[PDB]
Amino acid sequence: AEDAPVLSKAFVDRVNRLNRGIWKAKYDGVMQNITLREAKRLNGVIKSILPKRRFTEEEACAPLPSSFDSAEAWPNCPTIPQIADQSACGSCWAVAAASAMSDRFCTMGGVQDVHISAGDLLACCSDCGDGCNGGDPDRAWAYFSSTGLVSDYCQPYPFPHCSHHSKSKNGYPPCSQFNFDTPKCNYTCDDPCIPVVNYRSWTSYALQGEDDYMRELFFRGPFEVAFDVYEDFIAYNSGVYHHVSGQYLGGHAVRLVGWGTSNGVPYWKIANSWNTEWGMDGYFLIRRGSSECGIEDGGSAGIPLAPN
Ligand SMILES: *[C@@H]1O[C@H](CO)[C@@H](O[C@@H]2O[C@H](CO)[C@@H](O[C@@H]3O[C@H](CO)[C@@H](O)[C@H](O)[C@@H]3O)[C@H](O)[C@H]2NC(C)=O)[C@H](O)[C@H]1NC(C)=O
Ligand SMILES: *[C@@H]1O[C@H](CO)[C@@H](O[C@@H]2O[C@H](CO)[C@@H](O)[C@H](O)[C@H]2NC(C)=O)[C@H](O)[C@H]1NC(C)=O
Numbered sequence: 001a002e003d004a005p006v007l008s009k010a011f012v013d014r015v016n017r018l019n020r021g022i023w024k025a026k027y028d029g030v031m032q033n034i035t036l037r038e039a040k041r042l043n044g045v046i047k048s049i050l051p052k053r054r055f056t057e058e059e060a061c062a063p064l065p066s067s068f069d070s071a072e073a074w075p076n077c078p079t080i081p082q083i084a085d086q087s088a089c090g091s092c093w094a095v096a097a098a099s100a101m102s103d104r105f106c107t108m109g110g111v112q113d114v115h116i117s118a119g120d121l122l123a124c125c126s127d128c129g130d131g132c133n134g135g136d137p138d139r140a141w142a143y144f145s146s147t148g149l150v151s152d153y154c155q156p157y158p159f160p161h162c163s164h165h166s167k168s169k170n171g172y173p174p175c176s177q178f179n180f181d182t183p184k185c186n187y188t189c190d191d192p193c194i195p196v197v198n199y200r201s202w203t204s205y206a207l208q209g210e211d212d213y214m215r216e217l218f219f220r221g222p223f224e225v226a227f228d229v230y231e232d233f234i235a236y237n238s239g240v241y242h243h244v245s246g247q248y249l250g251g252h253a254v255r256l257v258g259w260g261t262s263n264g265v266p267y268w269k270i271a272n273s274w275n276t277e278w279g280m281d282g283y284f285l286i287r288r289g290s291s292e293c294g295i296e297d298g299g300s301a302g303i304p305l306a307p308n
Contacts, residue, residue: 023239044090045251083282089132107221109304131182
């Protein structure tokens, strides 16, 4: 919509009063100057076609710990702790998907360090939606099953790191300088001397509800979920987020990596795709148990097929 800032000092003071200090909002952080049009661009979920996940008796009746972190449970899987940067696209549906697929190749696929190409998925799955104008996480995982995806060695993400800060500590260029269209779908690597290797799942499925989410995470590792983004979330700095003010900005896809309790408040730990400058080093904590902003309404996951 507008070139009107999403944040104001008055808006953030209201938020910090209404949230009762359970989470901290910050006006003069990395998102201070973000525009209503740029904020809505980050939120690329539009629009089940996947079968519902079925647990065995042993999976369903296992006593889950009160704390869990995917990076500590699989300390030899180096993709889990890495933070993506979707850049100036509505590519979150594809970026969260490709991140969790990279992680599952190590947790289940016998491959320690492969990065699945978000670019390949964004550009070639026309059935998933319309690239940087948004798309459907469930269709992304169905595409990983039927067609498959190259690694980011074959097809690196086309859009560079960008900052919303004036002086980025990482020295990234501003995101205000960029506004990207869906890349072309290619059938060779960007360097055609790198041979094409196709990576597939043998099964893809849907999840619903706190219990399903914790069991899937514990047994199989990170997966893709989505929630409603309101203006207050843009200002998130630390603590367990819950919505208290601001208008609806769209659906956003993210990567669930953990859960815990912080001073009696249950949370999910989540890897965002807005680089390591935003939130808690690229992470946020959100309230678990009550489907906060619909986060527990729909997850998408799958089992990578081991190569050869
Ligand atoms: C499929 O292959 C094409 C290569 O033909 C990729 O599109 C190209 O993407 C690169 C970035 O990776 C673009 O480079 C940029 O050029 C602009 C000028 O328009 C400039 O602002 C930047 O400095 C940057 O270097 C290039 O424009 C673009 N070319 C074409 C013909 O589309 C595409 O990204 C590949 N798709 C995937 C999914 O990998
Ligand atoms: C948001 O933009 C404002 C200005 O529009 C930035 O504040 C200025 O930053 C310059 C460097 O670019 C400083 O030298 C000035 O002291 C600041 N001027 C004013 C008028 O405040 C601000 O840094 C931007 N915020 C973020 C976090 O990027």
